[PDB]
Design a protein around this ligand. Structure first.
Ligand code: NAP
Ligand code: SUZ
Length: 303
């Protein structure tokens, strides 16, 4: 199914995450994005940062070419990287992501992060960045625009901007049973802003930003015990948890079996008691936990 965004467009509630670390051959993104679409994924999450937009757009275009899907059946997101926050850089950055993917438009374009970088940190009025995203939606380059990694105060800045034309349709943030974002989720729902969860499965645990001593979400005993009760898997429990909270959830897998497993999230449900047990896992744990973000003046978790 799909959720209706506050601008009238529609977002599929389960999305495929395309990020893989640079040790993975660029060509794997092409193969696993085709598998994801074959499996039933219709929402595809990419970013300038991921260095995979050529491969991901080819996968989408290839699945249009063989008649498996139409362009309008695919929801494709890209993101503005943080060295392009200056308003004059936003449109060219988007047109580059479009040229790489070879698409006429993205369904969704996000400010990837509030933590601006020199075009070394930068100081940018993100309200001006936002005005330039608005113009991109006006131009038809992005169907919808939104933000990623914004905390409540940074989102309020956008929402209270003098002469705002379009609300962010979404805030894409770290969100999973260890860090379930209940308060931010409530705030978003009160503004008809969709919360989209990334690292919903515990993150890739990349050693550059994630402490390998952090607990492994998918080994959690409550998730395991739920997975055994429903005869599903811990990953599926964690994904279904978000859908029943009204969260759009991403899932990265470069594995053929797992990509196909993840679509099973539509095939079952959890009870109130299951949901309450999962909500009781919350421990304020963001897996991305690095000096590279934490020392930034607009670090979202400075809270
Ligand atoms: N906006 C941002 O700042 C931001 C930040 C992080 C992520 N994201 C987006 O969100 C996407 C997903 O988040 P993430 O990359 O942190 O990964 P994730 O979705 O939390 O997945 C973590 C690991 O879960 C494994 N997995 C997938 N399905 C599984 C299953 N059924 N059972 C067991 N393990 C399974 C995957 O390993 P395998 O590949 O081996 O299956 C994956 O590497 C990202 O790729 C990117 O598209 C955005
Ligand atoms: C892999 C990665 C992600 C995850 C994703 O989007 O899937 C990410 C998300 C952000 F909001 C910001 C940075 C990153 C990132 C790599 C990265 C980290 C620090 C820097 S610099 C040293 O500040 C540059 C790049």
């Amino acid at each position: 199914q799909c959720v209706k965004l506050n601008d009238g467009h529609f977002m599929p509630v389960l999305g495929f995450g395309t990020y893989a670390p640079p040790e993975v051959p660029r060509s794997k993104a092409l193969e696993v994005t085709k598998l994801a679409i074959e499996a039933g994924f219709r929402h595809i999450d990419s970013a300038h940062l991921y260095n995979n937009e050529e491969q991901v757009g080819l996968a989408i275009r290839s699945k249009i070419a063989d008649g498996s899907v139409k362009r309008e059946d695919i929801f494709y997101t890209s993101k503005l990287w943080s060295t392009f926050h200056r308003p004059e850089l936003v449109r060219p950055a988007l047109e580059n992501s479009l040229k790489k993917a070879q698409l006429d438009y993205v369904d969704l374009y996000l400010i990837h992060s509030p933590m601006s970088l020199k075009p070394i940190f930068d100081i940018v009025d993100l309200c001006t960045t936002w005005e330039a995203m608005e113009k991109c939606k006006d131009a038809g380059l992005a169907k919808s625009i939104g933000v990623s990694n914004f905390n409540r105060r940074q989102l309020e800045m956008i929402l209270n901007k003098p002469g705002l034309k379009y609300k962010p349709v979404c805030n894409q943030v770290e969100c999973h049973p260890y860090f379930n974002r209940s308060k931010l989720l409530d705030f978003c729902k009160s503004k008809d802003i969709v919360l989209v969860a990334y690292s919903a499965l515990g993150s890739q645990r990349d050693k550059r930003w994630v402490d390998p001593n952090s607990p492994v979400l998918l080994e959690d005993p409550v998730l395991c015990a739920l997975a055994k009760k429903h005869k599903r898997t811990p990953a599926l429990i964690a994904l279904r948890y978000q859908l029943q909270r009204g969260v759009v959830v991403l899932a990265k897998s470069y594995n053929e079996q797992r990509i196909r497993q993840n679509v099973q999230v539509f095939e079952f449900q959890l009870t109130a008691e299951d949901m309450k047990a999962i909500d009781g896992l919350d421990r304020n744990l963001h897996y991305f936990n690095s000096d590279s973000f934490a020392s930034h003046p607009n670090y979202p978790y400075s809270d």
